[PDB]
């Protein structure tokens, strides 16, 4: 896999949340892959560029407060 990057969201409940949040990144460019997971509270992205602070950004923008769990374990 390219790159995993994580988040920890606290306000994410719901599938639509959850699709609006996969959209609301995916947009960006670098994200190949998006696994948003509301309600366990994270959000996922496989990213083979740099997008981070870019995604940090789209969520915060959209109503949201993600914050940067590493990259990957
Ligand atoms: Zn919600």
Partial sequence: SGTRYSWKVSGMD???CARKVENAVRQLAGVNQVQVLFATEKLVVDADNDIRAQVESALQKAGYSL???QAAE
Avoid: F, G
């Fill in 14 to 16: 719901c599938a639509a």
């Fill in 67 to 69: 914050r940067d769990e």
